[PDB]
Design a protein around this ligand. Structure first.
Ligand code: NA
Ligand code: NA
Ligand SMILES: [Zn+2]
Ligand SMILES: [Zn+2]
Ligand SMILES: [Zn+2]
Ligand SMILES: [Zn+2]
Ligand SMILES: [Zn+2]
Ligand SMILES: [Zn+2]
Ligand SMILES: [Zn+2]
Ligand SMILES: [Zn+2]
Ligand SMILES: [Zn+2]
Ligand SMILES: [Zn+2]
Ligand SMILES: [Zn+2]
Ligand SMILES: [Zn+2]
Ligand SMILES: [Zn+2]
Ligand SMILES: [Zn+2]
Ligand SMILES: [Zn+2]
Ligand SMILES: [Zn+2]
Lengths: 216, 215
């Protein structure tokens, strides 16, 4: 039903892509971060058409170029707009294994890969990318803004109104619980936790995901 | 067309909708669940949204509403008082909100308070505080000190608000001072919930100030 963007901090937005699946509409959340030197994209739209809207939005309202885009794993909902991003000269950057799994599933090829947990800064804004272990996918990573204390958990974290874990096909049900606990131990002062497919909240989203993982 | 979303393990935001001046406007309140019942911050935006709200609480929280607390006298935060009261729920407000309610054909609250109050129900602590006139002369906020969640109602604007919105009953000269009182009473608030837009961090307070140096 399109693409929606909402502001949560003075320099942080959440972009939301929609797709109707069977019964009901499913959102997909990413982040936009504005810096003094360009915008950072955490996740593409849920495919090409949401991603073209997202780019058009960034150009109209932030009136700055996207310096980089960082998918959080290989699935279409977090990376299916990569081709759209790369066609505008924006570098897409992923973990090494996200690049591997994309190649094995005929997704595009990132422009750069990283094999290490990385902290970097653009335009006064610092970002951390971190691998807590397999959960939703073997390669899912999170992104932390330590200044705004905002943790983006992608499909690794579920929202407080999710009643189960959804699809478990590529899922790593055995590792997911320890990945959550890694997040709880590494970001003890996170203020906002952003899931992919529901509303965001406080650090209750980690304990709720842990709870879903002890009741299956 | 009521909607309820959870933001913390014991905190929901209830949202009614209306079109106002060609745009869709949400109105958010809180539901707080406690070991001894539910606390309601704001009613629905009128009778039908509030009975939806009441039914929601009974179906999913399956506990009675112990008290309801409107944050000022306008319909979006108080227009469902009768429906709450027909179910025996106590409505309690500041003394000045009761005066303005009587002055504008809203109902009569069951209890009024003239003091900033900290109280607890079922393990849950709540703070009600009057920072001064802003959106209306009587607006108060609600703070959950354990979750560090501040409900600012219509005193705070969301980060995509381009102006102050409804200013009819507003007190534009005091409003800046109330925002600064909030900034200094809740320096470590994690979430700030406005009435008529998405919630965020304490950026929402500095943003509301900005709308107030540039009107
Ligand atoms: Na990997
Ligand atoms: Na939310
Ligand atoms: Zn830059
Ligand atoms: Zn720029
Ligand atoms: Zn996925
Ligand atoms: Zn292309
Ligand atoms: Zn990079
Ligand atoms: Zn990386
Ligand atoms: Zn940061
Ligand atoms: Zn997903
Ligand atoms: Zn989710
Ligand atoms: Zn497995
Ligand atoms: Zn009002
Ligand atoms: Zn009114
Ligand atoms: Zn009071
Ligand atoms: Zn007034
Ligand atoms: Zn209002
Ligand atoms: Zn939030």
């Amino acid at each position: 039903q399109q693409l929606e963007v909402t502001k949560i901090s003075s320099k942080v937005w959440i972009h939301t892509s929609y797709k109707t699946y069977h019964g009901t509409v499913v959102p997909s959340h990413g982040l936009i971060v504005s810096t003094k030197e360009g915008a950072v994209l955490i996740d593409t739209g849920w495919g090409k058409e949401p991603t073209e809207e997202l780019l058009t939005w960034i150009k109209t309202n932030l009136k700055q170029p996207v310096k980089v885009c960082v998918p959080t794993h290989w699935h279409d909902d977090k990376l299916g707009g990569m081709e759209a991003v790369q066609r505008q000269g924006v570098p897409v950057v992923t973990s090494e294994l996200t690049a591997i799994l994309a190649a094995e599933n005929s997704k595009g090829t990132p422009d750069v890969t990283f094999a290490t947990d990385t902290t970097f800064a653009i335009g006064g804004q610092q970002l951390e990318v971190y691998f807590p272990g397999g959960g939703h996918t073997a390669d899912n990573v999170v992104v932390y803004l330590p200044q705004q204390k905002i943790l983006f958990g992608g499909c690794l974290v579920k929202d407080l109104q999710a009643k189960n874990l959804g699809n478990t096909a590529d899922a790593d049900l055995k590792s997911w619980p320890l990945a959550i606990q890694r997040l709880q131990q590494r970001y003890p002062k996170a203020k906002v936790v952003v899931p992919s497919h529901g509303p965001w909240g406080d650090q209750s989203l980690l304990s709720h995901t842990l709870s879903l993982l002890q009741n299956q």
